[PDB]
Write a protein that binds this ligand. Structure first.
Ligand SMILES: [Ca+2]
Ligand SMILES: [Ca+2]
Length: 108
């Protein structure tokens, strides 16, 4: 579970911050839930959850459902938010986010 590594309380605070459409920013969310200080294994576990269909990569539609991993009532990210998110993380430009890229994003 995601709460195996992250505090439900931190998650609540991160979600309340980005309730408005187009308010989302991965750097703010990542710090509020406390991803920045996690180890490779912990980051890999979080990645595995975000990779909802277990394909090994986080594709665009999964970035769309980014908040849904933290709360089933959370909103879907907008196309703009998703586009910017993917733009930030997709280093090699294959259109998706792999574990190495996710790690880099967390430790940036
Ligand atoms: Ca996937
Ligand atoms: Ca990529």
């Amino acid at each position: 579970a995601i709460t195996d590594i992250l505090s439900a309380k931190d998650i609540e605070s991160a979600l309340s911050s980005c309730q408005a459409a187009d308010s989302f920013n991965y750097k703010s969310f990542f710090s509020t839930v406390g991803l920045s200080s996690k180890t490779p294994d912990q980051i890999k576990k979080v990645f595995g959850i975000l990779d909802q269909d277990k394909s090994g990569f986080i594709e665009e539609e999964e970035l769309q459902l980014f908040l849904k991993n933290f709360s089933s009532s959370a909103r879907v990210l907008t196309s703009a938010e998703t586009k910017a998110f993917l733009a930030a993380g997709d280093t090699d430009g294959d259109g998706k986010i792999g574990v190495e890229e996710f790690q880099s994003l967390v430790k940036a």
